[PDB]
C-alpha cells in the first residue's frame, strides 16, 4: 500500500494511526518517584507504540523480526520525538503528560537527567523556531522508525523515499520555493542525528537507573533496554 | 522469541 | 558564504586531510586500541587544521568551534573511515597499511559490533555510490551540526546558515549529474538520514573508548584524552 | 580553555 499512495494519501494515513497522548499517574517527588512516574507512563505509551507502527503503511510489509528489530532500535527516539513535539506550545518546559508538565528544576529530582532535559528542551525549541507543521511530524517519527535500525531493506528504503516525496509535497503546497523545500527537508532530517543521540543518552541514564535499583521496570521495558545491550 | 514478538503480530 | 556551489566543493576538496599511516609491523586488545588510538590521535591534529578551512567555521568563537569539535571528532572519524573503505567489501581501511576485516574486531571486546556497523555504513555509501564531493559535504556537515543543539541566537544562525549553503551544493551536484528533481530530494534525505547512524556509531564507540580507559588497557593522548573527557 | 582552544587559536 505505501509505496502506491499519493502524497495526501500517506499524510492522512500516518494522522489517523496517531497514538493518543496519555496522561501520568502524578500525585512530593523524589529521584525515585519520578523515575517510576516517567517509567510507568513510558511503558503505557509503548503500548499504543507498538499499535501505532502496526498501522504505519510500509512497516506492516516487513517480516515480524524486522519489524521487532526495528521498533527495538527506534522505541525511545519515538517516544523522545513525542515529547518534544507535545512541548512545542510549552518553552523551558517538557509535557510528559497533560498533568506531567517538567521544569528544568524538576529534572534536577533524577540524577543525570537534567542533561537530557536541556537537549530535549533544544530540540523542542528548534521545532517551534521552525514552525514544524503535524503532518511534518507524522512523516519524521516514521522516518525515524523505519531508519534507525535499517542498517542493524530495499522496500524499507523505498518507503523512505516515499514520505520524503510526501514532506516535500507538503513545503510545496505550503508555498515554499524549491530551495526553500529543499533546505528545510535537510534542517529536518539533521534533527534526527540529534534525536538519535538524544535516545543513546536517555538509553545509558535508564540504564544506570536499573543497574542503581532506583526503579523496578517492567518486562517490556527491559526488553526494549536490553535490545540495546 | 521476546514478549515484544507477540505484542507486535498480534497486533 | 559569497562562494559559488563549485567553489563550495573546491574549498572543502582542496581542505580534505591526509589519508595516514599505522605501523607496517595477530592482534591482541593492546596492540590493536594501541595501534587505532595512535592512529586516531595523530588524524585528530590534522582534523583541527581542516575544520578551520571549512567554510563559515572559523568566523565562530573560539568557545563554539571547541565545542563543535568536541561534539564532532568520533562521527569525523567514523565517516572517514567509512569512506576509505568503500572499495574494500567487508573490510575496514584504518590506513593503507591497516586493512582490518570483522574477525579482526573480536581480538578486542565490544569492537566487533562496532565493526559490523562501520561496515554496514561503508556497503550503504557503496549501494547509492556516494561521490567525493556528497562525502565532503557530509562530513562538514556532521562538523556544523552535530554540535548545535541572545547573541548566542545570531551565532546559530551563521551555523543554520552555513548548513543552507551545503544542503544547496549538495542539491547543486545532483542537479549537475541529471538526478530528476525528485531523485534529488530523495538522495538529499538518503544522505542525510545516514548521519543519524553515524551518530549512533559514534555513541557506541564513545563509550568503548572510555570503557576501555577505565581498563588501563591502552596509553591515550592528552588530545584523544580531552575530547572523550568531553562527552 | 583547553588544548584544542590553542590549537584552533594558532
Ligand atoms: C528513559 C527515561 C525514562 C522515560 C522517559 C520518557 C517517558 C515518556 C516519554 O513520552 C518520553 C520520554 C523521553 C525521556 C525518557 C527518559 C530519559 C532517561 C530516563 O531513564
Ligand atoms: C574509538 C575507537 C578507536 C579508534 C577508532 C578509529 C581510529 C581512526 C579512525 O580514522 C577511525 C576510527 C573509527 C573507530 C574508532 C574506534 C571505535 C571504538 C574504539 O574505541
Request: aromatic share 6%.
Amino acid at each position: 500500500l505505501a509505496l502506491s499512495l499519493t502524497a495526501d494519501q500517506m499524510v492522512s494515513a500516518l494522522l489517523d494511526a496517531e497514538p493518543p497522548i496519555l496522561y501520568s499517574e502524578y500525585d512530593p517527588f523524589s529521584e525515585a518517584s519520578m523515575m517510576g512516574l516517567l517509567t510507568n507512563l513510558a511503558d503505557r505509551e509503548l503500548v499504543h507504540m507498538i499499535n501505532w507502527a502496526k498501522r504505519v503503511p510500509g512497516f506492516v510489509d516487513l517480516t515480524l523480526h524486522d519489524q521487532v528489530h526495528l521498533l527495538e532500535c527506534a522505541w525511545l527516539e519515538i517516544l523522545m520525538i513525542g515529547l518534544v513535539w507535545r512541548s512545542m506550545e510549552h518553552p523551558g518546559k517538557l509535557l510528559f503528560a497533560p498533568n506531567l508538565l517538567l521544569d528544568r528544576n524538576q529534572g534536577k529530582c533524577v540524577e543525570g537527567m537534567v542533561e537530557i532535559f536541556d537537549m530535549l528542551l533544544a530540540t523542542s525549541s528548534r521545532f517551534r523556531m521552525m514552525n514544524l507543521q503535524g503532518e511534518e511530524f507524522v512523516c519524521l517519527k516514521s522516518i525515524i522508525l523505519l531508519n534507525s535500525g535499517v542498517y542493524t531493506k530495499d522496500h524499507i528504503h523505498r518507503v523512505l523515499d516515499k514520505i520524503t516525496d510526501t514532506l516535500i509535497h507538503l513545503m510545496a503546497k505550503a508555498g515554499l520555493t524549491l530551495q526553500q523545500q529543499h533546505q528545510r527537508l535537510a534542517q529536518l532530517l539533521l534533527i534526527l542525528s540529534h534525536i538519535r543521540h538524544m535516545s543513546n543518552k536517555g538509553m545509558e541514564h535508564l540504564y544506570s537507573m536499573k543497574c542503581k535499583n532506583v526503579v523496578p521496570l517492567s518486562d517490556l521495558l527491559l526488553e526494549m533496554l536490553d535490545a540495546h545491550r | 522469541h521476546k514478549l515484544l514478538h507477540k505484542l507486535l503480530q498480534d497486533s
